[PDB]
């Protein structure tokens, strides 16, 4: 989803110059000029912009003012038109421009821009000079001006005569077909392929690829079973059905889109055809095709290579893939095993059984042995396939019972083959199970490693039982709350815009509730929220000590706090209360008067003095509003004088009961008088 | 454990306004006012706080002073009362407040706060104005004041008449029931559920979940054994016993607490019932329930899913879980194997044995074959279960001996099934063993990797044998001491309060023993200990070179040091000796006069000059005490002049033995005279 506005214009353009103006701003200021307009006008892009889209700076005394009034009327009524006006350049040469002005709509169908396309009718109108070396020189300057039409586009004209109307019609007809083609509408819309070209990540294409994965699995089950065991007519019916489906997939893989390394999407049918024909098309056509060649239908699962990169990333998905590959290879080498047994049981022209094959031993094991009439069969075909899959499963699972077990020469060659293949299939199943378990236990074991390091540290340094239980409680609580998420790292992945917007959403509990912040600009809100820090505190986990530096005013967005000065609660802070020190007015660091113990699990939103002062020095219009609207709930700097009632009572009891010292004492008293 | 003091008040309150005062501070200063009191009083929270809890700022000339004296008596005797007083607002409107004053106890049952709850009796007393637009306007202002009672709570009153006493009784009876309900006592107590609701992490509930895990294991062993092998009356007795226990678990899972993603605990019985009925209750009731349905008692181990998240994290615990799951699945598919053999041995109505099944081959193997009378049995039922568990264990362990080995059609279908299941069970056992070994060898192999990098570095850069052995000795010694604990990282996990308190405990060996630090404030102690660095040194591993910058005064908290100036020991530093340079008085960096070699394994506690100067500039009252009480044991800055006895002896021997040079020499001499 993008707004590919300019790219459409320069794609359809073929070297035509244009500028864009506003359709809602008075005098219609130029917002964009392409480089060809900078070459044609003789100006920079900086001096062209914020001039009028009617090119008022190119007007002159030779310009007809009624054409100017028609152009301004065209801008006033928002209609497509075209005009031919003598306008000036930066070197003031009279140039007969062909303008083609067109409004540009919105997604909401409101006109928002004026696209005006430019060309030159200098050679086709007349030469006029205020002063020149020659009439020939004025003609030469006119031919050097009118270049993009005559020298490039209208090249079949100047051999022929009477070409003025024809060249004007060609140059205007390019823009006239563009008047329906380039209506680019200035919308951030989704990029589209031409129709009859289906998308790669489409829902229909995804379920189509899933049902063709199911059908490749179907054919890989059934085709070796058919060619090995030599079996109705509904099976040929569904064979024709799945062949039709695979040829429909041939057509769909011809018509689909594609992802390359540089091109994230592919839109062109010749591009997808050239990408198709090298790799995929020849093996898929070799699959989609006398009976002995039917094994090449096993190349159908070559297109499961396309699902390869869909599900090669996920560990459980590649485990499910390898379990299916294990069972499929079991069926394949079961069919190979039956083919070997059926070869070996009647490899002799003398019709001898040789008394030794897995087929004959399976028959003699289960009953119904072989006998001749002819040569009457022994075991059932379904029982033979069941036992053959059983044998191949015993050899692939490395179980190896040995009921069905190889006993002749090519049987043991195949046994060596299946065991060396099944070793590696069993190993790769074990490897993906181990990889699944390590990638599913890594985030647990790193947490347990951090926790064991902390427990060993607090055991080693003889930290007391209360403080160590406190630290361990904090660590398990913040892990259970945060789910092991480094919030700084998750912010660092994002760019600066998303980082600021995420931080504004995190500190919305301050910025929507405080009257100091209800006047904040959007940029000031970003610049504040990038320096805010949300701080969670446990009950009894105090924030400021007595005498600690108060460098951070905190907004209690959740929970409750108490302010203990001299063992006495002085202020309870609730939801949406601001404490700390008034930094912008104090301009000095002070020690905290009082402890700030936390009553409940509380969420504060602190902000350091240096960061807040940076933001308030940069947003000078906001800083006065902050100073006028942020009343601190509790100044931690100011000392609150009081008396305890118990001490006042005891002093009243003592007042009811009741110069050599004064000379080293009144001195100090006078010092306090000077204080 | 928290002190949910305000939340209880605003939960029971239903929009009643209140302030809190101190019960031990004279004049009873307001420590908290809710937002409704800010709306009612017409003030901010900042101007209300530190005023008296009797609302002295709202007194006026129309206020009766004897009601004031009764209120101050109520504050003096610490008793619950209620009063109706005309008090002023910020816009000085006379308001008939209903106060309800109540003391608030402690966990130690001492009164510590005054909660006074507020309401309006403005409409119910009288209109009185100093000046007004109208008596009707004064009535309108009174109706706008008395809002929270009449417009909201007392809404059944104003249709009826004679409602004054009734509305006053209702508004005071809310607070009168609250006078027993909200006695919130201001204690950091544990949060409690209502009784007959049992805790999640409780010790009784944990051992209950463990015995029900044991019983689910019991039923998963016995129920397939029963339904497969078709077995007294004490077994039905213990069946009824365990069914009673499972229904007791139904009741307990109805009445327990619960943990959600947002809610860490759940206290409500309707909440736990609604959480129960979707997922757990329907499958547990399907479990806790003609004989052919007994297999659904295997759904009892669905509640072992609840222990899932108790022990899915620990690697050895999930290995023990998977070993038990392996053995349990062995027993299950052993029962399935016996059921298949018992089906296949008499699948014929002709009572033929077919000469081929694992049961018949096991009978013919071990003796006592099958014979008919009727059809007399072969092997013992216990021997059949033993051999069936043996077969299923051979197929799950991928051993596959082949005594007992499948030979018929559905037997080999089951064999393929058990081998494909046992492959993945064997793989996941192998994966958890590999994960256990990697997470138990990671902290060893990262240490060996660091040590190998160091040995390769000291081999590569041709560092000499003595220095390389020294570095390697340091590295293995600090690993054996620290157990591989990044002390900076373990501090960084903690918040600022716990970080400071841990650092104060780490530097307690300085802060309890030094007379310079016995005057330190608590905040100054935190601000010092966050910048202290404990430094361990090896014997012969010197700290300061000759001429090195002395930017850190060190406290030798353990071990002994020697100070070598010019190959001569000048001072031995023992436990609790401070050396370095007197930074606050010097205010310049100097070179060290002498080497400071370490005698034993010593622990110093250094602190850099810049950090110490920051702390002493911020704690100006502490800095003078530090300067007066910290005598440096050895000034490393000052040069100590002396003479060696051997050189004095040799010079005495030479003194007993004994202008063209002076002109380039006496000049220098005079320079030294100007020095």
CSV table of N, CA and C in Angstrom, one decimal, chain A residues 323 326 362 365-366 383 386-387 390 393-394 397-401 403 426 430 433-434 437-438 441 444-445 448-449 453-454 456-457 460-464 467 470-471 474-475 539 541-542 545-547 549 560 562 568-572 577 591 599-600 631 633 642-645 648, chain B residues 1-3 6 22 24-26 28 31-32 44-45 49-50 186 312-314 318 356 391 395 398-402 405-407 409 412-413 415-416 419-420 423-424 426-428 430-432 434-435 438-439 443 481 485 487 490 493 495 497-498 501-502 505-506 508 523 526 618-619:
chain,number,residue,atom,x,y,z
A,323,UNK,N,8.0,-36.1,9.7
A,323,UNK,CA,7.2,-37.2,10.1
A,323,UNK,C,6.5,-37.7,8.9
A,326,UNK,N,9.0,-39.3,6.6
A,326,UNK,CA,9.3,-40.6,7.1
A,326,UNK,C,8.3,-41.7,6.7
A,362,UNK,N,7.0,-65.2,4.5
A,362,UNK,CA,5.8,-64.6,5.1
A,362,UNK,C,4.6,-65.5,4.8
A,365,UNK,N,4.9,-68.4,7.1
A,365,UNK,CA,4.6,-68.0,8.5
A,365,UNK,C,3.1,-67.8,8.7
A,366,UNK,N,2.4,-67.0,7.9
A,366,UNK,CA,1.0,-66.7,8.2
A,366,UNK,C,0.0,-67.8,7.8
A,383,UNK,N,-2.5,-58.1,2.8
A,383,UNK,CA,-1.6,-58.6,3.8
A,383,UNK,C,-0.2,-58.4,3.5
A,386,UNK,N,0.6,-54.8,3.9
A,386,UNK,CA,0.7,-54.5,5.3
A,386,UNK,C,2.0,-55.0,5.9
A,387,UNK,N,2.4,-56.2,5.6
A,387,UNK,CA,3.6,-56.7,6.2
A,387,UNK,C,4.9,-56.1,5.5
A,390,UNK,N,5.2,-52.9,7.3
A,390,UNK,CA,5.8,-53.3,8.6
A,390,UNK,C,7.3,-53.5,8.6
A,393,UNK,N,9.0,-50.3,8.0
A,393,UNK,CA,9.0,-49.5,9.3
A,393,UNK,C,9.9,-50.0,10.3
A,394,UNK,N,10.1,-51.3,10.4
A,394,UNK,CA,11.1,-51.9,11.3
A,394,UNK,C,12.5,-51.5,11.0
A,397,UNK,N,12.7,-47.5,11.7
A,397,UNK,CA,12.6,-47.0,13.1
A,397,UNK,C,13.8,-47.6,13.9
A,398,UNK,N,14.7,-48.4,13.2
A,398,UNK,CA,15.8,-49.1,13.8
A,398,UNK,C,15.3,-50.1,14.9
A,399,UNK,N,14.1,-50.6,14.7
A,399,UNK,CA,13.6,-51.6,15.6
A,399,UNK,C,14.0,-53.0,15.2
A,400,UNK,N,13.6,-53.4,14.0
A,400,UNK,CA,14.1,-54.6,13.5
A,400,UNK,C,13.7,-55.9,14.3
A,401,UNK,N,12.5,-56.2,14.2
A,401,UNK,CA,12.0,-57.4,14.9
A,401,UNK,C,12.6,-58.7,14.3
A,403,UNK,N,10.8,-60.9,12.2
A,403,UNK,CA,9.8,-61.8,11.5
A,403,UNK,C,10.0,-61.8,10.0
A,426,UNK,N,16.2,-41.2,10.6
A,426,UNK,CA,15.9,-41.2,12.0
A,426,UNK,C,16.8,-40.2,12.7
A,430,UNK,N,15.4,-36.9,14.9
A,430,UNK,CA,16.0,-36.7,16.3
A,430,UNK,C,16.6,-35.3,16.4
A,433,UNK,N,13.7,-32.8,16.6
A,433,UNK,CA,13.1,-32.8,17.9
A,433,UNK,C,14.0,-32.1,19.0
A,434,UNK,N,15.3,-32.4,18.9
A,434,UNK,CA,16.2,-31.7,19.8
A,434,UNK,C,16.2,-30.2,19.5
A,437,UNK,N,13.2,-28.7,21.1
A,437,UNK,CA,13.2,-28.6,22.5
A,437,UNK,C,14.2,-27.6,23.0
A,438,UNK,N,15.3,-27.3,22.3
A,438,UNK,CA,16.2,-26.3,22.8
A,438,UNK,C,15.6,-24.9,22.5
A,441,UNK,N,13.0,-24.4,25.1
A,441,UNK,CA,13.5,-24.2,26.5
A,441,UNK,C,14.5,-23.1,26.7
A,444,UNK,N,13.2,-20.3,28.9
A,444,UNK,CA,13.1,-20.7,30.3
A,444,UNK,C,14.4,-20.8,31.0
A,445,UNK,N,15.4,-21.5,30.3
A,445,UNK,CA,16.7,-21.7,30.9
A,445,UNK,C,17.5,-20.5,31.1
A,448,UNK,N,16.1,-19.1,34.3
A,448,UNK,CA,16.6,-19.9,35.4
A,448,UNK,C,18.1,-19.7,35.7
A,449,UNK,N,18.8,-19.4,34.6
A,449,UNK,CA,20.2,-19.1,34.8
A,449,UNK,C,20.4,-17.7,35.5
A,453,UNK,N,22.1,-17.3,39.2
A,453,UNK,CA,23.2,-16.4,39.4
A,453,UNK,C,22.8,-15.4,40.5
A,454,UNK,N,21.6,-15.0,40.6
A,454,UNK,CA,21.2,-14.1,41.7
A,454,UNK,C,21.2,-14.8,43.0
A,456,UNK,N,22.9,-17.5,43.8
A,456,UNK,CA,24.3,-17.7,44.2
A,456,UNK,C,25.0,-16.4,44.7
A,457,UNK,N,24.6,-15.3,44.1
A,457,UNK,CA,25.2,-14.0,44.5
A,457,UNK,C,24.8,-13.6,45.9
A,460,UNK,N,26.5,-15.9,48.3
A,460,UNK,CA,27.9,-15.7,48.4
A,460,UNK,C,28.3,-14.5,49.2
A,461,UNK,N,27.6,-13.3,49.0
A,461,UNK,CA,28.0,-12.1,49.7
A,461,UNK,C,27.3,-11.9,51.0
A,462,UNK,N,26.7,-13.0,51.5
A,462,UNK,CA,26.1,-13.0,52.9
A,462,UNK,C,25.0,-11.8,53.0
A,463,UNK,N,24.3,-11.6,52.0
A,463,UNK,CA,23.2,-10.6,52.0
A,463,UNK,C,22.1,-11.2,53.0
A,464,UNK,N,21.5,-10.5,53.9
A,464,UNK,CA,20.6,-11.1,54.9
A,464,UNK,C,19.3,-11.7,54.2
A,467,UNK,N,16.5,-9.1,53.0
A,467,UNK,CA,16.8,-8.4,51.7
A,467,UNK,C,17.0,-9.3,50.6
A,470,UNK,N,13.6,-10.3,49.5
A,470,UNK,CA,13.0,-9.1,48.8
A,470,UNK,C,13.5,-9.0,47.4
A,471,UNK,N,14.8,-9.2,47.1
A,471,UNK,CA,15.4,-9.1,45.8
A,471,UNK,C,14.9,-10.2,44.9
A,474,UNK,N,11.3,-9.5,44.0
A,474,UNK,CA,11.2,-8.5,42.9
A,474,UNK,C,11.5,-9.2,41.6
A,475,UNK,N,12.5,-10.0,41.5
A,475,UNK,CA,13.0,-10.6,40.2
A,475,UNK,C,11.9,-11.5,39.7
A,539,UNK,N,5.1,-3.1,47.3
A,539,UNK,CA,4.7,-2.5,48.5
A,539,UNK,C,5.9,-2.5,49.5
A,541,UNK,N,8.5,-0.8,49.1
A,541,UNK,CA,9.7,-0.6,48.4
A,541,UNK,C,9.8,0.9,48.1
A,542,UNK,N,10.5,1.7,48.9
A,542,UNK,CA,10.4,3.1,48.9
A,542,UNK,C,11.2,3.6,47.7
A,545,UNK,N,14.8,8.1,49.4
A,545,UNK,CA,15.3,8.1,50.7
A,545,UNK,C,15.1,9.5,51.4
A,546,UNK,N,15.4,9.6,52.7
A,546,UNK,CA,15.6,10.9,53.3
A,546,UNK,C,17.0,11.4,52.8
A,547,UNK,N,17.0,12.5,52.3
A,547,UNK,CA,18.3,13.1,51.8
A,547,UNK,C,18.8,12.7,50.5
A,549,UNK,N,18.9,12.6,46.4
A,549,UNK,CA,18.7,13.7,45.5
A,549,UNK,C,17.4,13.5,44.7
A,560,UNK,N,-0.9,3.7,45.3
A,560,UNK,CA,-0.8,4.7,46.3
A,560,UNK,C,0.5,4.7,47.0
A,562,UNK,N,3.0,6.7,50.3
A,562,UNK,CA,2.9,7.6,51.4
A,562,UNK,C,4.2,8.3,51.6
A,568,UNK,N,6.5,10.0,60.4
A,568,UNK,CA,5.1,10.5,60.3
A,568,UNK,C,4.7,10.6,58.9
A,569,UNK,N,3.5,10.0,58.6
A,569,UNK,CA,3.0,10.2,57.2
A,569,UNK,C,2.6,11.6,57.0
A,570,UNK,N,3.0,12.2,55.9
A,570,UNK,CA,2.8,13.6,55.7
A,570,UNK,C,1.9,13.8,54.5
A,571,UNK,N,1.9,12.9,53.5
A,571,UNK,CA,1.0,13.0,52.3
A,571,UNK,C,0.8,11.6,51.7
A,572,UNK,N,-0.4,11.3,51.4
A,572,UNK,CA,-0.7,10.1,50.7
A,572,UNK,C,-0.9,10.5,49.2
A,577,UNK,N,-1.1,11.8,40.8
A,577,UNK,CA,-0.5,12.9,41.6
A,577,UNK,C,1.0,13.0,41.3
A,591,UNK,N,18.3,17.8,48.4
A,591,UNK,CA,18.1,16.5,49.1
A,591,UNK,C,16.6,16.4,49.4
A,599,UNK,N,2.7,2.1,49.1
A,599,UNK,CA,1.7,1.3,49.8
A,599,UNK,C,1.3,0.0,49.1
A,600,UNK,N,0.9,0.2,47.8
A,600,UNK,CA,0.5,-1.0,47.0
A,600,UNK,C,1.5,-1.2,45.9
A,631,UNK,N,0.8,21.8,39.4
A,631,UNK,CA,1.0,21.9,40.8
A,631,UNK,C,1.5,20.6,41.3
A,633,UNK,N,2.0,17.8,43.9
A,633,UNK,CA,1.2,17.3,45.0
A,633,UNK,C,2.0,17.4,46.3
A,642,UNK,N,6.4,20.7,62.1
A,642,UNK,CA,5.3,20.3,62.8
A,642,UNK,C,5.8,19.9,64.2
A,643,UNK,N,4.8,19.3,65.0
A,643,UNK,CA,5.2,18.8,66.3
A,643,UNK,C,4.4,17.5,66.5
A,644,UNK,N,4.9,16.6,67.2
A,644,UNK,CA,4.2,15.4,67.6
A,644,UNK,C,3.4,15.6,68.8
A,645,UNK,N,2.2,15.0,68.8
A,645,UNK,CA,1.2,15.3,69.9
A,645,UNK,C,1.8,14.6,71.2
A,648,UNK,N,4.5,16.8,72.4
A,648,UNK,CA,3.9,18.1,73.0
A,648,UNK,C,3.3,17.8,74.3
B,1,UNK,N,1.1,-9.2,49.8
B,1,UNK,CA,1.1,-8.4,51.0
B,1,UNK,C,1.2,-6.9,50.6
B,2,UNK,N,0.2,-6.1,51.0
B,2,UNK,CA,0.1,-4.7,50.6
B,2,UNK,C,-0.7,-4.0,51.7
B,3,UNK,N,-0.8,-2.7,51.6
B,3,UNK,CA,-1.7,-1.9,52.4
B,3,UNK,C,-2.7,-1.2,51.5
B,6,UNK,N,-6.6,3.0,50.7
B,6,UNK,CA,-7.6,3.9,50.0
B,6,UNK,C,-8.6,3.1,49.2
B,22,UNK,N,-3.4,13.3,60.4
B,22,UNK,CA,-2.6,12.6,61.3
B,22,UNK,C,-3.2,12.6,62.7
B,24,UNK,N,-1.1,11.8,65.3
B,24,UNK,CA,0.0,12.0,66.2
B,24,UNK,C,0.6,13.4,66.0
B,25,UNK,N,0.2,14.1,65.0
B,25,UNK,CA,0.8,15.4,64.7
B,25,UNK,C,-0.2,16.5,65.1
B,26,UNK,N,0.4,17.5,65.8
B,26,UNK,CA,-0.5,18.6,66.3
B,26,UNK,C,-1.1,19.3,65.1
B,28,UNK,N,-3.4,18.3,63.5
B,28,UNK,CA,-3.9,17.2,62.6
B,28,UNK,C,-3.9,17.6,61.1
B,31,UNK,N,-3.5,14.8,55.2
B,31,UNK,CA,-2.5,14.1,54.4
B,31,UNK,C,-3.1,13.6,53.1
B,32,UNK,N,-4.4,13.5,53.0
B,32,UNK,CA,-5.0,13.0,51.7
B,32,UNK,C,-6.4,13.5,51.6
B,44,UNK,N,-8.0,22.8,45.3
B,44,UNK,CA,-7.1,21.8,44.8
B,44,UNK,C,-6.8,20.8,45.9
B,45,UNK,N,-6.0,19.8,45.5
B,45,UNK,CA,-5.5,18.9,46.5
B,45,UNK,C,-4.2,19.5,47.2
B,49,UNK,N,-4.1,20.1,51.5
B,49,UNK,CA,-3.1,19.4,52.3
B,49,UNK,C,-2.3,20.3,53.1
B,50,UNK,N,-1.9,19.9,54.3
B,50,UNK,CA,-1.3,20.5,55.4
B,50,UNK,C,-2.2,21.6,56.1
B,186,UNK,N,-4.8,0.2,58.3
B,186,UNK,CA,-3.6,0.8,57.7
B,186,UNK,C,-2.4,-0.2,57.9
B,312,UNK,N,6.6,-27.7,33.5
B,312,UNK,CA,7.0,-27.7,32.2
B,312,UNK,C,8.3,-26.9,32.0
B,313,UNK,N,8.7,-26.2,33.0
B,313,UNK,CA,9.9,-25.3,32.9
B,313,UNK,C,11.2,-26.1,33.2
B,314,UNK,N,11.2,-26.9,34.2
B,314,UNK,CA,12.4,-27.6,34.7
B,314,UNK,C,12.7,-28.8,33.8
B,318,UNK,N,10.7,-32.3,33.5
B,318,UNK,CA,10.1,-32.8,32.3
B,318,UNK,C,10.7,-34.0,31.7
B,356,UNK,N,-1.5,-69.0,14.2
B,356,UNK,CA,-0.7,-67.8,14.0
B,356,UNK,C,-1.3,-66.6,14.7
B,391,UNK,N,6.8,-56.8,24.9
B,391,UNK,CA,6.7,-56.5,23.5
B,391,UNK,C,6.6,-55.0,23.2
B,395,UNK,N,9.2,-52.5,21.3
B,395,UNK,CA,8.9,-51.6,20.2
B,395,UNK,C,9.1,-50.2,20.5
B,398,UNK,N,13.0,-49.2,20.6
B,398,UNK,CA,13.6,-49.5,19.4
B,398,UNK,C,14.6,-50.7,19.5
B,399,UNK,N,14.3,-51.6,20.4
B,399,UNK,CA,15.2,-52.7,20.6
B,399,UNK,C,14.7,-53.8,19.7
B,400,UNK,N,13.5,-54.3,19.9
B,400,UNK,CA,13.0,-55.2,18.9
B,400,UNK,C,13.7,-56.6,18.9
B,401,UNK,N,13.5,-57.4,20.0
B,401,UNK,CA,14.2,-58.7,20.0
B,401,UNK,C,13.6,-59.6,19.0
B,402,UNK,N,12.3,-59.8,19.1
B,402,UNK,CA,11.6,-60.6,18.1
B,402,UNK,C,11.2,-62.0,18.6
B,405,UNK,N,6.5,-61.0,18.4
B,405,UNK,CA,6.7,-60.1,17.3
B,405,UNK,C,5.5,-60.3,16.4
B,406,UNK,N,5.0,-59.3,15.7
B,406,UNK,CA,3.7,-59.4,15.1
B,406,UNK,C,3.7,-60.2,13.8
B,407,UNK,N,2.6,-60.9,13.6
B,407,UNK,CA,2.6,-61.8,12.5
B,407,UNK,C,1.3,-61.9,11.7
B,409,UNK,N,-2.4,-59.5,10.3
B,409,UNK,CA,-2.6,-58.2,9.5
B,409,UNK,C,-2.8,-57.0,10.4
B,412,UNK,N,0.3,-56.2,12.4
B,412,UNK,CA,1.3,-55.4,11.8
B,412,UNK,C,0.8,-54.0,11.5
B,413,UNK,N,-0.5,-53.8,11.4
B,413,UNK,CA,-1.0,-52.4,11.4
B,413,UNK,C,-0.7,-51.7,12.8
B,415,UNK,N,1.7,-52.6,14.7
B,415,UNK,CA,3.1,-52.6,14.8
B,415,UNK,C,3.6,-51.3,14.1
B,416,UNK,N,3.1,-51.0,12.9
B,416,UNK,CA,3.5,-49.8,12.3
B,416,UNK,C,3.1,-48.6,13.1
B,419,UNK,N,5.4,-48.3,16.2
B,419,UNK,CA,6.7,-47.9,15.9
B,419,UNK,C,6.8,-46.5,15.5
B,420,UNK,N,5.8,-46.0,14.8
B,420,UNK,CA,5.8,-44.6,14.5
B,420,UNK,C,5.5,-43.7,15.7
B,423,UNK,N,8.9,-44.0,17.9
B,423,UNK,CA,10.0,-43.2,17.3
B,423,UNK,C,10.0,-41.8,17.9
B,424,UNK,N,8.8,-41.2,17.9
B,424,UNK,CA,8.7,-39.8,18.4
B,424,UNK,C,8.8,-39.7,19.9
B,426,UNK,N,10.7,-41.8,21.7
B,426,UNK,CA,12.1,-42.0,21.9
B,426,UNK,C,12.9,-40.8,21.5
B,427,UNK,N,12.5,-40.1,20.5
B,427,UNK,CA,13.1,-38.9,20.1
B,427,UNK,C,12.9,-37.8,21.1
B,428,UNK,N,11.7,-37.7,21.7
B,428,UNK,CA,11.6,-36.6,22.6
B,428,UNK,C,12.2,-36.8,23.9
B,430,UNK,N,15.2,-38.3,24.0
B,430,UNK,CA,16.5,-38.0,23.6
B,430,UNK,C,16.7,-36.5,23.5
B,431,UNK,N,15.7,-35.8,23.1
B,431,UNK,CA,15.8,-34.3,23.0
B,431,UNK,C,15.8,-33.7,24.4
B,432,UNK,N,15.0,-34.2,25.3
B,432,UNK,CA,15.1,-33.6,26.6
B,432,UNK,C,16.4,-34.0,27.4
B,434,UNK,N,19.3,-34.3,25.8
B,434,UNK,CA,20.2,-33.4,25.2
B,434,UNK,C,20.1,-32.0,25.7
B,435,UNK,N,18.8,-31.5,25.9
B,435,UNK,CA,18.6,-30.2,26.4
B,435,UNK,C,19.1,-30.0,27.8
B,438,UNK,N,22.9,-29.8,27.6
B,438,UNK,CA,23.4,-28.5,27.2
B,438,UNK,C,23.2,-27.4,28.2
B,439,UNK,N,22.0,-27.4,28.8
B,439,UNK,CA,21.8,-26.4,29.8
B,439,UNK,C,22.5,-26.7,31.1
B,443,UNK,N,27.3,-23.3,31.4
B,443,UNK,CA,28.1,-22.4,32.2
B,443,UNK,C,29.5,-22.9,32.5
B,481,UNK,N,36.3,-18.0,43.0
B,481,UNK,CA,35.7,-17.1,44.0
B,481,UNK,C,34.3,-16.7,43.7
B,485,UNK,N,29.8,-14.9,38.3
B,485,UNK,CA,28.7,-14.0,38.6
B,485,UNK,C,29.2,-12.6,38.2
B,487,UNK,N,28.9,-9.3,38.8
B,487,UNK,CA,28.3,-8.5,39.9
B,487,UNK,C,27.6,-7.2,39.4
B,490,UNK,N,24.2,-8.5,38.0
B,490,UNK,CA,23.3,-8.8,39.1
B,490,UNK,C,22.9,-7.6,39.8
B,493,UNK,N,20.1,-6.0,37.4
B,493,UNK,CA,18.7,-6.5,37.4
B,493,UNK,C,17.9,-5.8,38.4
B,495,UNK,N,16.3,-2.9,41.1
B,495,UNK,CA,16.0,-1.5,40.9
B,495,UNK,C,16.9,-0.6,41.7
B,497,UNK,N,16.6,1.2,44.5
B,497,UNK,CA,16.5,1.0,45.9
B,497,UNK,C,17.2,-0.2,46.4
B,498,UNK,N,16.9,-1.4,45.7
B,498,UNK,CA,17.6,-2.6,46.1
B,498,UNK,C,19.0,-2.6,45.7
B,501,UNK,N,20.7,-0.7,48.4
B,501,UNK,CA,20.8,-1.5,49.7
B,501,UNK,C,21.7,-2.7,49.7
B,502,UNK,N,21.8,-3.3,48.5
B,502,UNK,CA,22.8,-4.4,48.3
B,502,UNK,C,24.2,-3.8,48.4
B,505,UNK,N,25.1,-3.1,51.9
B,505,UNK,CA,25.5,-4.4,52.6
B,505,UNK,C,26.8,-4.9,52.1
B,506,UNK,N,27.2,-4.6,50.8
B,506,UNK,CA,28.5,-5.1,50.4
B,506,UNK,C,29.6,-4.3,51.0
B,508,UNK,N,29.3,-2.7,54.0
B,508,UNK,CA,29.2,-2.6,55.4
B,508,UNK,C,30.5,-2.8,56.1
B,523,UNK,N,20.9,8.3,53.2
B,523,UNK,CA,21.0,8.7,51.8
B,523,UNK,C,22.4,8.9,51.3
B,526,UNK,N,23.8,5.4,50.8
B,526,UNK,CA,23.5,4.9,49.5
B,526,UNK,C,24.3,5.5,48.4
B,618,UNK,N,27.8,17.2,47.2
B,618,UNK,CA,26.3,17.2,47.3
B,618,UNK,C,25.9,17.1,48.8
B,619,UNK,N,26.7,16.4,49.6
B,619,UNK,CA,26.4,16.2,51.1
B,619,UNK,C,27.4,17.1,51.8
